[PDB]
Design a protein around this ligand. Structure first.
Ligand SMILES: Nc1ncnc2c1ncn2[C@@H]1O[C@H](COP(=O)(O)OP(=O)(O)OC[C@H]2O[C@H](O)[C@H](O)[C@@H]2O)[C@@H](O)[C@H]1O
Ligand SMILES: [Mg+2]
Ligand SMILES: [Mg+2]
Length: 338
């Protein structure tokens, strides 16, 4: 609410992400709309633990705040120390190898452990994107959002399939912080940026080496546009065309679709729930990697709808919600310079 990049949008963004992670984590790797509507009834303190999505998002934001800038060695070290402090947050199986290499003080090029992952091709998991929302709070221009979404993602995700998913998620939060938009304008801006990135020769090769379609994020954003004009869209159709998995390309477009779809009321979700709430409910109903898809749709929706749509009863159920709010306020003061 309010002006572009307002305090309310900053707070709402990080709280929306935290709600998505904590509430989504109950359905992790499973889901039906009726049973989700039953499960959110228990939300009406800090009993819901957060996962790696929030742990890494907190480390990313604390690094930006400590250096008032992107610092790859500070951020890599905060990622690795956060893992060491609490390894049981539900990290991806591969990225733990990156953390353990970063914890070796002999490692003096912090981008190289990510590049060795998966036979030297790098991870395409959604972990670079799940934590990226703070980049869009710290940087206002598209150029800087792309640049540091990429760099922060590359600390663990060296494949363009992974870091371009982080950029797409950061760009979606960047646009949501600007306020009112049609769904079709929002989508068209994202598609334009991804078509530009996916023209790059390294992206084309990464996609071809995996057997994927030309311009994979651009293709899925086009599928979102078709789905948004389609009659009687079912959850099975959404999952079939966009995915609900741990790969960045099977979850980041899915999160954006959930945001865009839920800009309008849904007769199947009770009207007592506000727009942020129905986005999270809809996201979780897709199943699959629910904590990460919901954390990403929640970061976008929180930035768009602001803190007045963050319900106190939901927020106060989440582990660390006060520290999340303080970090959002600090980003607004330090980087937006209020
Ligand atoms: N290039 C690849 N080739 C084959 N498998 C891959 C590749 N990249 C990723 N995977 C598979 O993808 C897995 C995860 O990639 P990881 O880089 O460990 O970590 P994340 O941070 O992205 O975690 C991704 C999500 O998974 C959990 O739900 C987390 O909470 C995240 O939400 C690998 O173990 C591989 O099996
Ligand atoms: Mg998680
Ligand atoms: Mg996950």
């Amino acid at each position: 609410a309010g002006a572009a990049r307002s305090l309310s949008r900053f707070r709402g963004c990080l709280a929306g992400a935290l709600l998505g992670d904590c509430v989504g984590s109950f359905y992790e790797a499973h889901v039906d709309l009726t049973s989700v509507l039953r499960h959110v009834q228990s939300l009406e303190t800090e009993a819901l633990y957060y996962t790696d999505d929030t742990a890494m998002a907190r480390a990313l934001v604390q690094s930006l705040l400590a250096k008032e800038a992107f610092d790859e060695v500070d951020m890599a070290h905060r990622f690795a120390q956060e893992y060491k402090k609490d390894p049981d947050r539900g990290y991806g199986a591969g990225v733990v190898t990156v953390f353990k290499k970063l914890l070796n003080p002999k490692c003096r090029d912090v981008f190289e452990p990510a590049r060795a992952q998966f036979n030297g091709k790098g991870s395409y998991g959604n972990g670079g994107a799940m934590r990226v929302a703070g980049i869009s709070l710290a940087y206002s221009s598209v150029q800087d959002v792309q640049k540091f979404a990429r760099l922060s993602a590359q600390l663990t995700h060296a494949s363009s399939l992974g870091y371009n998913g982080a950029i797409l998620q950061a760009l979606a939060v960047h646009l949501a912080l600007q306020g009112e938009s049609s769904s079709e304008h929002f989508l068209k801006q994202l598609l334009g940026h991804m078509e530009d990135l996916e023209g790059d020769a390294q992206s084309v090769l990464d996609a071809r080496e995996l057997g994927m379609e030309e311009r994979p994020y651009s293709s899925r954003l086009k599928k979102i546009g078709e789905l948004l004009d389609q009659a009687s869209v079912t959850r099975e159709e959404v999952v079939s065309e966009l995915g609900n998995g741990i790969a960045a390309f099977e979850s980041v477009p899915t999160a954006i679709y959930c945001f865009l779809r839920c800009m309008e009321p849904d007769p199947e979700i009770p009207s007592a729930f506000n727009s942020l709430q129905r986005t999270l409910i809809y996201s979780i109903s897709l199943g699959g990697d629910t904590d990460t898809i919901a954390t990403m749709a929640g970061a976008i929706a929180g930035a768009y709808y602001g803190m007045d749509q963050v319900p106190e009863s939901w927020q106060q159920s989440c582990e660390g919600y006060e520290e999340t709010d303080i970090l959002a306020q600090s980003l607004h003061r330090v980087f937006q310079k209020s």
